[PDB]
UniProtKB/Swiss-Prot annotation, chains A, B:
It comes from Pseudonocardia thermophila. Industrial production of acrylamide is now being developed using some of these enzymes. This is Cobalt-containing nitrile hydratase subunit beta. It holds the Pfam family NHase_beta_C. One of its GO terms (molecular function) is nitrile hydratase activity. The keyword Lyase applies. Belongs to the nitrile hydratase subunit beta family.
From Swiss-Prot, chains C, D:
Co(2+) binds at residues 107, 110-112. This is Cobalt-containing nitrile hydratase subunit alpha. Heterotetramer of two alpha and two beta chains. GO terms for molecular function: cobalt ion binding; nitrile hydratase activity. It comes from Pseudonocardia thermophila.
Amino acid sequence: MNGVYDVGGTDGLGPINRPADEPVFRAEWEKVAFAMFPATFRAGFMGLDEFRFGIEQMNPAEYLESPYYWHWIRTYIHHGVRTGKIDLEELERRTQYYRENPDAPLPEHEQKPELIEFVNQAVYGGLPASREVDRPPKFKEGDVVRFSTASPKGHARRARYVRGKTGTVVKHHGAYIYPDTAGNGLGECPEHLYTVRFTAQELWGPEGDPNSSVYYDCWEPYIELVDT
Amino acid sequence: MNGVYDVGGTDGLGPINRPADEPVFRAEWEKVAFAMFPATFRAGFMGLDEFRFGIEQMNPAEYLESPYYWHWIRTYIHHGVRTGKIDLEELERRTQYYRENPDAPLPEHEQKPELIEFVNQAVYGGLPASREVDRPPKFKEGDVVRFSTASPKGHARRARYVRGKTGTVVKHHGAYIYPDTAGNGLGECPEHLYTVRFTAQELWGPEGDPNSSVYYDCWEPYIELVDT
Amino acid sequence: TENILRKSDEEIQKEITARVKALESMLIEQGILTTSMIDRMAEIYENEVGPHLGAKVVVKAWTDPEFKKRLLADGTEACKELGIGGLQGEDMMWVENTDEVHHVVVCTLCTCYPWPVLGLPPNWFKEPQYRSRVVREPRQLLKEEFGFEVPPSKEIKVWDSSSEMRFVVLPQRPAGTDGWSEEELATLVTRESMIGVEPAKAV
Amino acid sequence: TENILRKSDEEIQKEITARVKALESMLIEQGILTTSMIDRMAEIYENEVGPHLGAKVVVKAWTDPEFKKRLLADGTEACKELGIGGLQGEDMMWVENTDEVHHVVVCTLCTCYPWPVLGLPPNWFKEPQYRSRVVREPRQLLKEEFGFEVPPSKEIKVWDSSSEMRFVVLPQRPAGTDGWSEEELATLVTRESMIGVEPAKAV
């Protein structure tokens, strides 16, 4: 979609705040929001591409200034409602309870070994997105290609600053899960993935470093040939 | 510049809030912020193009959710500091005073007839931006032109959704104050102004109404010829 | 929309009020701002300049085809005939809705609006929801927000006012009004009708 | 930056805390979340997975030219030799800084980062200030924010990780370290050095 999260090329966002050191997790709630990602993933809330689209639908001012892991909370709730796994009135009534009883205990529960095994498996074996396809890559290194001008309203990885731009295919990576379907609940429908090189001048006009380039990854449908 | 105020084509901003009726000014402070525009204009704080660039430098989250006339306040302060006419520590100390003494009186002052005459003159005679130039228009109706890809960091009227796009010159309006200099304190340097027509498909890809167009005004340097 | 970061609307107003009064007090002492000058500005745009001025032009064009021509060839000049014009309408270009074409106006980069005929824009016109979506999905937004159905087969032209040129829609005269006096027709002419977000009132 | 609309950082935390605990309580009762499973996640990325893993690869490539080749031909596979990999580094492509070319990595659309060798990204990498400006003005941002001067004549390549491919910079080995043991070289290898925002430590 065309949301504020797509910040590449934006001006006026402010200088970088970079403390000399910061902990991994700044508060207990951050650990919780973090662990909730494998938990809702295993449970069918969403996958990786759908997770991202949930954040992409946040209120823009909250996205820009809220703590990062709060975005994850937003996306969990988003897909909890979407899938019926989360009832909102129950959630709002309980928030009120923990506002007024911040030290009340959490629900009684059994520990589950399979959730730890799940955790360990994912962390160390990864969740690979590459896939085999019956079609051969349409493009190759050195091909000149132009980036699609389409502006779909669902999830995609089509940064506005590359749309309609021209570049050179750098590497073909194999085929991977396609965000434009995956992120919209339409399945993996894997496509070939390529890195494409865009000069800063192509990207920014005269304001572009004549000696700088941006490398951007494009799924096959994003790019049509210019020169081979 | 490339800021969040440049919203054309953005998604996810939310539905329109449109009360059945609303007053011109929703609070006394709004009248004040409004009148301050002629007041700082006459006083040399800024002109119209510089005014806009002040708003364009607002913190993005505040711009998106704050009351409209608060943006004007921000721009006044911005150019008050820029020109030395506003000392910030004095301003912050006084804000504190009116927080704690919201009913304290305003400074004693004389009324000035010339400020009313100024007001009446501007409202009814306008502040025309059109200007005569020694050069003839470079373009004409029917010319196919492409919009500049430059991404200047100062003020300009180069919406991101038109950059690098192709359209047809619709009308030539005469020459007008050029924002790209005016808004950056560099003078009027007037350029010829043209309306240009962009189809929705040119603008949005396949997601564009095959039966809709966007008409956008371009100063002469924004557009280079394609087909005459 | 909900933002867990945002203070209450009451705490926001209290801050803004103190800040404006402190800024006000400083420009008063510089001699550049006065109470009478604030009041005048407010009187003009609260009571004097408003969309009743535009409705007068519209009903003239609807009843005077030769004036309608002049309005379409040069808008500022035509409106001047009726003693209408000035600040933020110094260059005014009127666009005529037909059976073939619908016009709608926006300012995506800021909040430009033809004050001498419409007065100050309503808040929805200045806000990012309208500005961001009308250039991208005019047809849907007009039904969805204003229940205004443009048949799929009719062109919609969105005029993004990026310059000091001010675009104003000449809405089509409603059927059923043949022989109506200028005063009676005016009641059909709405702010919304000259933005392009609605037609003039039915009936 | 200042936002007159924003509540205090303390009021923000209190709200977020209640909301997360209420959400937590619900997924606990669904049987999909447990305390042990939260703790494990936190232990792994607080103590186990971090940029010390990347520094080990780097110092191997700096001392083993044949491994350096393998790392550059296929990164995941090469890192697997050292028992390094997994979640969010399933596809890993390392890019080698030279005297002719400097590399810097960003995720402008979200917050993608190669966890198995760098652990979780610092907050500045996820935030919009870095993400929005590095693709547009890499050279200035590197001096201005990190005091890292890339001579005007050296190319800078910005790698925007828009896919599940994870890009990692192989920083140049500092001069003065000829004959150093892998352990001693490692101390020169920084998180920042493998993002491209800095070189490895001088001296």
